[PDB]
Amino acid sequence: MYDWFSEMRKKDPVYYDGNIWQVFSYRYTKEVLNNFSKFSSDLTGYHERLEDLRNGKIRFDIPTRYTMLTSDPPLHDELRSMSADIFSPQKLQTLETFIRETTRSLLDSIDPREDDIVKKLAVPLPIIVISKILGLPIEDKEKFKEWSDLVAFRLGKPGEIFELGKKYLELIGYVKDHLNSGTEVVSRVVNSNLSDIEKLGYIILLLIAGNETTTNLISNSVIDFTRFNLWQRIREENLYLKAIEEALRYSPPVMRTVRKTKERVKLGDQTIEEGEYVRVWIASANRDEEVFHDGEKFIPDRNPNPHLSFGSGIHLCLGAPLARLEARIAIEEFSKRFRHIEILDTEKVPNEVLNGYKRLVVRLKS
Numbered sequence: 001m002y003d004w005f006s007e008m009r010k011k012d013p014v015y016y017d018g019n020i021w022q023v024f025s026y027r028y029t030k031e032v033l034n035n036f037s038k039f040s041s042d043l044t045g046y047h048e049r050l051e052d053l054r055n056g057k058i059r060f061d062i063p064t065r066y067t068m069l070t071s072d073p074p075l076h077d078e079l080r081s082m083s084a085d086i087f088s089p090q091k092l093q094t095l096e097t098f099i100r101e102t103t104r105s106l107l108d109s110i111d112p113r114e115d116d117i118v119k120k121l122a123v124p125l126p127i128i129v130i131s132k133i134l135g136l137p138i139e140d141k142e143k144f145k146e147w148s149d150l151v152a153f154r155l156g157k158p159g160e161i162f163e164l165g166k167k168y169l170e171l172i173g174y175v176k177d178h179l180n181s182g183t184e185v186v187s188r189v190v191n192s193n194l195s196d197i198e199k200l201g202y203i204i205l206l207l208i209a210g211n212e213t214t215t216n217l218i219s220n221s222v223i224d225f226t227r228f229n230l231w232q233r234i235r236e237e238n239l240y241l242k243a244i245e246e247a248l249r250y251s252p253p254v255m256r257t258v259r260k261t262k263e264r265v266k267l268g269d270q271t272i273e274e275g276e277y278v279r280v281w282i283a284s285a286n287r288d289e290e291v292f293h294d295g296e297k298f299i300p301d302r303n304p305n306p307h308l309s310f311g312s313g314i315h316l317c318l319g320a321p322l323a324r325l326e327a328r329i330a331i332e333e334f335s336k337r338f339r340h341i342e343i344l345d346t347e348k349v350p351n352e353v354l355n356g357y358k359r360l361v362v363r364l365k366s
């Protein structure tokens with residue numbers, strides 16, 4: 001739908017279609033994403049229940065409604081600072097050796113004759129790495145796989161309530177059982193003024209926030225380098241870092257994100273009222289020609305590359321450096337093992353927000 005995007009960016013960068021507002025240009029989406037005083041992330045009524053939550057008035061509730069993701073400062077900033085260092089420079093750099101062997105190990109499990117990279121590499125890598133970060137038994141890998149579907153970017157769909165209940169029951173249970181059998185991060189959360197529901201939420205967020213998204217990054221990366229025949233150039237010129245940033249821009253794992261108007265506001269020429277939902281098209285902004293020259297083309301050594309795939313502002317993705325660090329090592333290690341890659345079959349994930357693949361069958365030449 002990138003062609004429509006380009007038409008909207010030129011005619012109605014800030015457009016209203018009846019029920020919701022939609023922003024298509026880099027300029028305005030960055031604005032919406034950065035300006036929290038006017039465009040809020042309090043979509044689950046977290047701020048309205050913070051007292052009854054920290055007072056005990058509220059006993060049970062879906063924990064995912066109360067995380068740094070659905071909050072505005074100061075609350076947002078209080079929550080984020082508890083773990084804002086676990087995904088740091090020196091910090092993650094120490095997970096490097098672990099990430100390499102892990103992918104190296106996963107690579108060993110592939111059958112070049114024919115195989116699915118999504119299932120054998122793209123799916124497991126992030127899960128195994130986050131389990132290690134959180135201190136959870138890598139043996140419950142499969143469980144984490146199914147709960148990953150609960151990620152916040154995914155909207156509803158008919159007759160799915162029973163399955164979700166089953167997932168939530170087990171998810172919440174699993175997390176309760178391991179609250180004191182965790183790392184420094186979980187410890188910090190467990191020993192905060194936060195409520196029980198909030199602590200559960202926190203852990204679940206850190207747990208499933210980057211599984212499906214990072215998996216999509218790796219898959220999209222393989223598809224793009226392959227279809228544009230960039231593998232040799234990338235190994236030869238060593239463009240992994242930049243090439244991954246271009247993949248993030250061209251094939252964004254999260255196509256859009258939402259905000260709610262905290263009050264009346266004027267975005268560009270439009271005056272969005274108070275309480276209206278504003279859809280921010282990340283995929284569109286990323287092809288903005290004013291900002292990105294030759295944006296429709298995949299330029300592997302683009303630089304700089306100020307894309308908005310990890311968002312912008314105070315909510316800029318907490319695990320971005322991890323995500324980057326993970327994709328880069330997988331791609332490096334992948335490009336070293338197989339000599340040529342043949343794309344045999346593909347099944348795209350059927351979601352409007354999450355952009356990625358369900359299956360990716362390839363024949364590799366060692």
Ligand code: HEM
Binds near residue numbers: 070209211310314
């Ligand atoms: C390529 C992979 C990923 C992409 C494209 C992605 C994208 C995003 C985007 C678009 C946001 C901003 C949401 C908004 O502003 O409304 C976000 C938030 C967040 N992401 Fe990621 N993400 C990825 C991987 C990860 C990883 C590996 C983790 C690690 C646990 C993670 C943890 C989070 C958290 C905790 C937030 C909330 C930050 C806050 O509200 O302060 N993400 N992500």
